[PDB]
Amino acid sequence: PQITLWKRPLVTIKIGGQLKEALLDTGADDTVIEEMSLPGRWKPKMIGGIGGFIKVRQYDQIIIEICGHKAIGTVLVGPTPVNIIGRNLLTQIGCTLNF
Amino acid sequence: PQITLWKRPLVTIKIGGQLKEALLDTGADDTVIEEMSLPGRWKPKMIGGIGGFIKVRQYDQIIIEICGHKAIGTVLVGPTPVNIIGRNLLTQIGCTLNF
Ligand SMILES: O=C(CC(c1ccc(F)cc1)c1ccc(F)cc1)Nc1cccc(F)c1CC[C@H]1CNCCN1S(=O)(=O)c1ccccc1
Ligand SMILES: [Cl-]
Ligand SMILES: [Cl-]
Ligand SMILES: [Cl-]
Ligand SMILES: [Cl-]
């Protein structure tokens, strides 16, 4: 699809068999989701935002659907204000910025 | 143009007679620029997200040139780690997400 930016580009994602809302964010290097249970081992990661740095849990090769487009990749879990789909997954679904 | 998301979508902008590098950020509602002088009245505002909040100065009706496209809108000025072009100005240059 083609998504304008007059409102937040919020889309439905499916992760761990559950539907959630997430923001398509070109300004985010990685994907970060609110607290949830994910399988496997996690690795430590620090991400920086507008107000400073936060610690998150990094899970790899996680299956996730974004607006019905299938992706498998790195998902970070931590104290994020909203679920954010960053460039790591936007590139997987072939998302581009156009003007 | 068509901007892919393999790397950070950094562009050159012209604001208040200065050239700056800024990130095209669909996840940001507002445009936030590092400390600089802007003309006119301003009001304080708090903006937040990953890492918490920061205090900024809100200037209205500011002209910005993004990739040669002229846009007018509110610009927040404060201690941001990166200059951000948010949705309030991305809509003005007719920027869309496509996949
Ligand atoms: O990719 C990064 C680092 C990045 C950055 C971007 C913006 C920013 F404000 C702070 C850092 C960066 C760092 C240094 C540099 F020179 C160029 C870019 N961050 C990261 C990684 C995974 C996930 C993730 F969410 C984030 C944060 C994304 C940002 C920007 N898009 C909106 C959501 N946020 S926010 O800080 O919450 C925010 C909220 C309201 C207004 C403005 C920013
Ligand atoms: Cl959707
Ligand atoms: Cl990934
Ligand atoms: Cl505005
Ligand atoms: Cl439009």
Side-chain angles (χ1 to χ4, degrees):
Chain A
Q2 172 161 104
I3 302 161
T4 62
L5 302 170
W6 305 97
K7 60 182 185 177
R8 289 179 176 137
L10 288 168
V11 301
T12 299
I13 63 162
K14 180 160 78 174
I15 183 165
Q18 293 305 317
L19 298 184
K20 291 175 192 276
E21 190 176 65
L23 184 66
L24 300 187
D25 187 3
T26 59
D29 296 339
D30 321 293
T31 293
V32 62
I33 304 297
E34 300 158 349
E35 189 56 54
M36 77 173 291
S37 166
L38 292 180
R41 285 184 62 87
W42 61 272
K43 291 205 286 277
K45 203 188 157 74
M46 213 83 184
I47 58 168
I50 193 74
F53 289 83
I54 65 154
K55 285 190 173 176
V56 296
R57 302 195 310 273
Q58 171 175 337
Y59 296 83
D60 297 322
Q61 263 167 258
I62 297 296
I63 289 155
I64 178 170
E65 263 178 39
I66 302 150
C67 190
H69 291 241
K70 291 172 153 85
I72 310 168
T74 302
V75 171
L76 308 178
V77 181
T80 181
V82 287
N83 292 323
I84 288 157
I85 307 311
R87 300 187 291 99
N88 73 307
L89 302 180
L90 295 172
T91 61
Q92 282 204 24
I93 69 176
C95 185
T96 62
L97 279 169
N98 303 76
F99 61 97
Chain B
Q2 178 164 276
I3 302 160
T4 59
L5 303 166
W6 299 105
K7 65 182 189 167
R8 292 172 179 162
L10 292 169
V11 299
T12 300
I13 65 159
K14 193 170 184 183
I15 181 176
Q18 304 177 212
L19 292 172
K20 290 193 174 290
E21 289 301 302
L23 183 72
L24 299 184
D25 183 357
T26 62
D29 301 332
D30 313 304
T31 292
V32 62
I33 306 295
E34 66 203 338
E35 285 296 343
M36 71 174 294
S37 161
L38 284 180
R41 288 193 63 82
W42 61 267
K43 62 190 175 188
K45 182 176 174 83
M46 290 286 283
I47 56 168
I50 278 168
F53 286 73
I54 65 162
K55 187 175 177 197
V56 297
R57 293 186 328 267
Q58 177 188 333
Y59 292 86
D60 303 312
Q61 300 184 312
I62 303 295
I63 302 146
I64 302 194
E65 206 168 314
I66 308 154
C67 296
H69 299 252
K70 284 175 190 73
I72 192 162
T74 294
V75 175
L76 312 174
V77 179
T80 181
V82 57
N83 296 321
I84 295 165
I85 301 305
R87 295 187 296 100
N88 74 307
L89 297 181
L90 293 169
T91 58
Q92 302 304 103
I93 67 164
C95 185
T96 58
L97 286 166
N98 294 269
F99 62 103

